[PDB]
Structure 1
Amino acid sequence: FQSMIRDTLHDLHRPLGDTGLAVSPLGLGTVKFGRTIPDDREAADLLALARDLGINLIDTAPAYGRSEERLGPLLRGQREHWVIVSKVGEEFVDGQSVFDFSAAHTRRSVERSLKRLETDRIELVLVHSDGNDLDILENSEVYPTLAALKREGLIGAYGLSGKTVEGGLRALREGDCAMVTYNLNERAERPVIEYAAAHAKGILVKKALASGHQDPVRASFELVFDQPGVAAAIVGTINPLHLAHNVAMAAQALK
């Protein structure tokens, strides 16, 4: 019948730095769950297929519309399978993104994220930067507040979803992990990956698949997984066929 899903990631799980979390080399991104948007049916099916494809990493944020809110119900009965990544600091209110890196808001957001996800703890929470990484990590209350929340047991680990190489490097000094951009067009954040590789620190790659130039997805994954520092790449696709394909190419790139 239909075993088009021959190639999976079950035997390619890798540790995410020194956090003690093991993750599939691909993670499911759920921006498009909240932003055309999947039907609750389509979303449950995408999770179900991701699971059977060997994925156990899922990425979300307060800023991704209702992604968080929707995931709680959708993950009922299976939460234990998933390493959840979420974020603090970006909010998307009327028209536009809004940023707040106060301790009050950090604590309020993570409480709300736990509530929305119907769970007592989130594996990884990343600072959701406006671009000004270094200033946020130095002169705001967010990073020490995340540190407290880690001690309190509400989060498993913390880090930065940055845009700058200097920010990514600071995040790794005290924090556990950096989510960095790395693709065929944009390789400026390579040093952050190299540093992480040297000091047992977590790297998640975002935007692995964008381009301007023999499958493009395979070429992208070859570039990304040539860096030893990378634990997983987050992919944004909601098309189940493209997801199965993405997974196939990732398995081929890792041989």
Structure 2
Amino acid sequence: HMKKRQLGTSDLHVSELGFGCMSLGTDETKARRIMDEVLELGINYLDTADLYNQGLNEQFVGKALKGRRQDIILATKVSKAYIKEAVKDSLRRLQTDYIDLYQLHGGTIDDPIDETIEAFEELKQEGVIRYYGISSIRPNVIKEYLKRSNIVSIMMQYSILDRRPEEWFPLIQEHGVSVVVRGPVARGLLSRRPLPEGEGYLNYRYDELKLLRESLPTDRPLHELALQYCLAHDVVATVAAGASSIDQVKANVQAVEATPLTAEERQHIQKLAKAAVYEQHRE
């Protein structure tokens, strides 16, 4: 019942919900129980990289991979020497010999871009990684890697409340690249938790958040609307929703497996929600 999408033009076919951004805890036995359940749910994409300051314990993930490596798409994150030495450390902890998707974090336009690209290409030629991508909300970085590199994915914060990525979707898609979503529920603001009084989100004030929760369609839970809004864009290959329990993972799976938005439902959310753009790092 978990559908998959092609990650860019790569050979990786990733579950629409990916797993990351959940603590596996201190007990290895409990951690492996959590991972077994994740995989049992049909999630096959595991990103160990920090998302919102929460990553996955690589030693624990490594033990969960045992006997089924080929069935899992493993992503991690990281001048040529640094990029090479870094993935070696992850592989040792993960007890495997290749990463499916190796992603650059912290890229800027002032980095040594040719050197960086060459590092990833050499790792890919040698089979240490299968593909590479970036994690970025900087259009100037995105444009450079799309023009100059063979990235297959860009990880971006994206939700009903942060539509800044959408400006770049046509460009990304024209290059045959996919987006991997973080923050699809806006860190809880698109769920059942209260809106903290007086606090906003990006260019929303508190009162605008309150109003938008009320005005959005009420025929689906807000959490489901949020995940299905992300998925309603073909450029999106997978969404990495946050979870701090197996119950929360199952809730995410159920919402991703619900009926997709129609064209109409999508156009409706598009009208109701703000459509902001990135102010910084555009060029």
TM-score relative to the length of structure 2: 0.73
How far off its partner does 1:242 sit?
Answer: 1.4
1:84 counterpart (49, 63, 74): 74
For 1:242, the equivalent position in structure 2 comes to 248
Unaligned runs of 5+ in 1: 1-7, 89-101
How far off its partner does 1:141 sit?
Answer: 3.1
* Matched positions, count: 227
For 1:135, the equivalent position in structure 2 comes to 110
Identity, in percent, stands at: 26
1:70 counterpart (42, 45, 60): 60
CA distance in 1 between partners of 2:35 and 2:169 (Å) = 28
Unaligned runs of 5+ in 2: 190-208, 262-283
Aligned with 2:34: secondary structure? helix
TM-score relative to the length of structure 1: 0.81
CA distance in 2 between partners of 1:45 and 1:192 (Å) = 39
Asked if the contact 2:158–2:165 (Cα under 8 Å) also holds between the matched residues in 1, the reply is yes
Amino acid at match of 2:110: D
2:136 counterpart (162, 166, 171): 162
Aligned with 1:141: secondary structure? helix
Bigger Rg, structure 1 or 2 = 2
Give RMSD over aligned pairs.
2.2
Q: Is 2:92 the partner of 1:115?
A: yes
How far off its partner does 1:59 sit?
Answer: 0.4
For 1:15, the equivalent position in structure 2 comes to 6
Runs of 4+ residues deviating >6 angstroms: none
CA distance in 1 between partners of 2:127 and 2:117 (Å) = 15
How far off its partner does 1:218 sit?
Answer: 0.8
1:42 counterpart (30, 42, 51): 30
Superposed counterparts of 1:189-208, under 5 Å: 189-208=165-184
CA distance in 1 between partners of 2:96 and 2:10 (Å) = 19
CA distance in 2 between partners of 1:68 and 1:144 (Å) = 26
For 1:177, the equivalent position in structure 2 comes to 153
Deviations 1:51-94 (A, max 9, x none): 22111000013886772233222322222221001001xxxxxx
Asked if the contact 1:61–1:68 (Cα under 8 Å) also holds between the matched residues in 2, the reply is no
Asked if the contact 1:127–1:142 (Cα under 8 Å) also holds between the matched residues in 2, the reply is no
Superposed counterparts of 1:141-160, under 5 Å: 141-160=115-134
How far off its partner does 1:243 sit?
Answer: 1.0
Q: Is 2:2 the partner of 1:27?
A: no
Aligned with 2:176: secondary structure? coil
CA distance in 1 between partners of 2:183 and 2:56 (Å) = 21
Aligned with 1:217: secondary structure? helix
CA distance in 1 between partners of 2:230 and 2:32 (Å) = 28
